[PDB]
RNA sequence: AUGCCCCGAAACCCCCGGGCUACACGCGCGCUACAAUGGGCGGGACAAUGGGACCCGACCCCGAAAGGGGAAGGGAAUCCCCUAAACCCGCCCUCAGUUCGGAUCGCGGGCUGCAACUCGCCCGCGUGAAGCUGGAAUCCCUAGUACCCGCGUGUCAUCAUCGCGC
RNA sequence: CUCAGGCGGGUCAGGAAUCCGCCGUAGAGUGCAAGGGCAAAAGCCGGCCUGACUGGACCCGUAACAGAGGCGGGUCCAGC
């Protein structure tokens, strides 16, 4: 089935301003909106639209975990920084309105082994 | 999906009367797969929603892994003919959206899907008895000529030409009721 | 009057010797607060015994389950405030309710979010310590 | 604070991101409960210690709640936190995994903070896991003490099942 | 009434549960070894029954040709 968030199709979210869709947002990303957008992230910004417009070639790698993807950033692999490496994360229509940090993980899996000599009372 | 041959094939079934087929048989299937109280509600649920008596298949072989003995009464399956057959295959048709995947159509122009859920004049009347809902539903057809390879007497095969085809069922399915798909 | 030991509303059996409110607590999607809510909404005593319920009464319960918003019921004391699909206002029971929640469950899964992540490996999602306490084994 | 040894363009100094918050498992100390010596609803009474300047904030208006806007007085025996709970009266529940239990998760709305996904707290509706009194063993306490029940403060931009007192 | 096995289709259902078509000379089954025989049956599913009976005759095999106590089998008459 076609995507639609809130009723609103993709290209119609495009369109949409950013009032609009802080308005569509959940409660934590509206207020994050609404209080606005710090530097580095606006760096972001700028280089997503560039990538978009077509004059940015490079790869896109950041350390912004904390932001929160827009309907215009749709359509990219973004390189999020993970605390060692640039993990790719390929933005897709459903991601929009979550924190790009989630999809970024740090931690590894555990498959604990054998317990060790203290691990009990004997 | 697109049939080519529509045109050329209704001159045909126009031109030819007795090379209409119809729906000889609808088969609804119950897979209960237990012999327990759910088995006697899928019989009543038919019972009440068909018109006719069930039938008790039992299980050929025993296999411990799906928790069931040889010989043991495991689903149920009716048959139905006729007018009758036509309204409820026509009721039941509407119950899911009036598509068909056009790649589910046998080699002989045979077809059939399944619904997991009662919906065509379901009735709310389930929380007395229900909850093993689902039924596999699959339409037999035949131009009208096919008991000379059923009766008794003077049995004889009928040729590869008087047979139907995958194409033409489609088309007929089409031109009675019912819309395809392209599955994809 | 017809006092019935057992009333089925909305698909689902209830008790003909329990109050409106807790009898209607029985489905899922419904609880003590919202099933005095739709009582309330209904004009029906809360405290009266189920079984004592007519048809039109039936009816008139399970039109409000299925649009209790538009009922008079409050858009916040709903099951889905906002439809992640259509956008508006949602009040899910049992079966819709069970299959909304799968449905969110498997969304965040496939789009690999950490939650989706959390919840495929079972463990918690919420952001709790797990080295003294959730102990399955 | 300091002896010797060591690093001394690095182990020194700043900045960004992550971690200390992981999780088959063993243990200490606690909170919540396993219900009638009670749960829910409406109603009716009673404290003290302390703190308050980017601070406490009456009072008024909006909101269903969290919360939002204006704003008097108080440098504190003058104003605020501050009309606590246990307890009492009336009704429903009547021994049941339930109108006990409140983990675990869905959606949605807010607060602080430059930043809330890793990794904060709060409220609405929905959901409803173990638990029906506990083996060997083991701990505190001699009077306004033990038990029961709430409040102040230290940490604090937000966060108290925590330490110190009432 | 027709089997084994296979091809195409169908909600849970997956290699394998129950179902709908086509092909299918027996590749199945027939209590048990092997051989032989069996497809509108000798196989699978049902209805009724107890000829798995009584009194007898003759004949073949064990034992060719070529002798036999005991035993097995075959063709019949009568009774019920």
Redesign the pocket.
Known sequence: KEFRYRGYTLEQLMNMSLEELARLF???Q???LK??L?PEQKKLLRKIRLAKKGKYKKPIRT?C??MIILPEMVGLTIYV????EFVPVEIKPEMIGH?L??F?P??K??E??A?GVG???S | VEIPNKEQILADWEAHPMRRPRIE?V?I??????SGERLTKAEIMLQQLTGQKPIR?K???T?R????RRGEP??V?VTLRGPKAYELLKRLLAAVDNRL?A??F???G???????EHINIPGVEYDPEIGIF?????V?LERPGFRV?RR?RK?A?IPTRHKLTKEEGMVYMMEEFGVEIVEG | ANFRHIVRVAGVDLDGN??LR?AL?A?????????TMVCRVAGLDPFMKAGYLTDEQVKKIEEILADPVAHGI?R???????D?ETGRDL?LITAK?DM??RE??MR?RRIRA??GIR?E?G??????????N????
């Open positions: 959940p409660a934590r509206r207020r994050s209080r606005g710090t350390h975990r904390d920084h993970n605390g060692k924190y940090g989630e970024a740090t931690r899996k555990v604990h082994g317990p691990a009990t009372r | 048989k088969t299937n119950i897979g209960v797969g237990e298949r299980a050929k072989k296999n892994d799906f928790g069931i495991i689903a399956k995947k790649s589910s046998d080699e002989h045979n077809v059939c899907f399944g619904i997991e689902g039924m596999d539903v699959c037999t390879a008794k049995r095969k | 329990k109050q807790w607590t489905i899922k999607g419904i609880g003590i607060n919202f099933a409050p916040w004391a709903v099951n889905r405030p906002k992640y009040h309710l909304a929640i969110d469950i965040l950490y939650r919840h490996l463990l918690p999602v919420r952001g709790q310590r797990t080295r003294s959730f102990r399955r084994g």
